[PDB]
Design an enzyme around this catalytic site. Structure first.
Site, PDB file in Angstrom:
ATOM      1  N   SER B 110     -16.090 -14.694  -7.076  1.00 31.77           N
ATOM      2  CA  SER B 110     -14.630 -14.438  -7.255  1.00 31.77           C
ATOM      3  C   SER B 110     -13.881 -15.673  -7.728  1.00 31.77           C
ATOM      4  O   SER B 110     -12.878 -15.546  -8.451  1.00 31.77           O
ATOM      5  CB  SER B 110     -13.974 -13.924  -6.027  1.00 31.77           C
ATOM      6  OG  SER B 110     -14.011 -14.967  -5.103  1.00 31.77           O
ATOM      7  N   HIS B 163      -9.979 -18.465  -4.719  1.00 33.65           N
ATOM      8  CA  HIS B 163      -9.201 -17.607  -5.600  1.00 33.65           C
ATOM      9  C   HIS B 163      -8.121 -18.376  -6.356  1.00 33.65           C
ATOM     10  O   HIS B 163      -8.071 -18.346  -7.588  1.00 33.65           O
ATOM     11  CB  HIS B 163      -8.573 -16.447  -4.801  1.00 33.65           C
ATOM     12  CG  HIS B 163      -9.569 -15.507  -4.198  1.00 33.65           C
ATOM     13  ND1 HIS B 163      -9.196 -14.461  -3.384  1.00 33.65           N
ATOM     14  CD2 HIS B 163     -10.920 -15.457  -4.287  1.00 33.65           C
ATOM     15  CE1 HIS B 163     -10.273 -13.800  -3.003  1.00 33.65           C
ATOM     16  NE2 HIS B 163     -11.336 -14.381  -3.538  1.00 33.65           N
TER      17      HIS B 163
END
Lengths: 5, 181
Positions: B110, B163
């Site tokens: 991610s 992230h």
């Protein structure tokens, strides 16, 4: 706990 | 979509994931996680191999989906090299920041994925001629997704540093890339 990227 | 680096990455994540199902999560983690011990700091692969680890079918499929969709576009439109560089910088930087946020026990693609999200959107915005872009229709989710990790959505422990760091890094690379040519 573990953390999900 | 049919890019080598796109598929080589998907293949590695699936190999590693299967390895995690045979050996167990923790046993793969002791070797692939970010260095938990500065003694281990010279095991260089760990700065990148944390990107390969996933802890649920949902985790990996959701990541590979985005990766195939976004990684594919960069590979096709911009070459395999640009993709690798994006993948290596964001795996290195988002690992780095995530370790600072909550320590060394994390993994998943991610970090690289938000970097691709950040990149494709900022690059499609400033350099339309580069032939890539991100639906506002996605950037929404993007932002829901990131802020939902802030609230640990229904017990889902998300790598919040990964992230944002990844996202930031993609934006910097795309902005810099959207000044040349």
């Amino acid at each position: 706990a573990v953390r999900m990227a | 979509r049919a890019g080598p680096v796109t598929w080589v990455m998907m293949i590695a994540c699936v190999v590693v994931f299967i390895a995690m199902q045979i050996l167990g999560d923790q046993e793969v983690m002791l070797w692939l996680a970010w260095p938990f011990d500065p003694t281990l700091k010279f095991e260089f692969w760990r700065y990148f191999t944390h990107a390969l680890m996933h802890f649920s079918l949902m985790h990996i499929l959701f990541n590979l989906l985005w990766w195939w969709y976004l990684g594919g576009a960069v590979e096709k439109r911009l070459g395999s090299g640009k993709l690798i560089v994006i993948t290596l910088i964001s795996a290195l930087l988002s690992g780095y920041v995530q370790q600072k946020f909550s320590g060394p026990w994390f993994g998943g693609l991610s970090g690289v994925v938000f970097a691709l999200m950040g990149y494709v959107w900022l690059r499609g915005e400033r350099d339309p001629q580069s032939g890539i872009y991100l639906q506002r229709g996605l950037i929404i989710f993007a932002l829901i997704w990131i802020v939902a990790g802030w609230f640990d959505l229904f017990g889902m422990s998300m790598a919040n540093g990964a992230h944002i760091a990844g996202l930031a890094v993609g934006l910097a690379m795309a902005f810099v890339d959207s000044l040349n040519a």
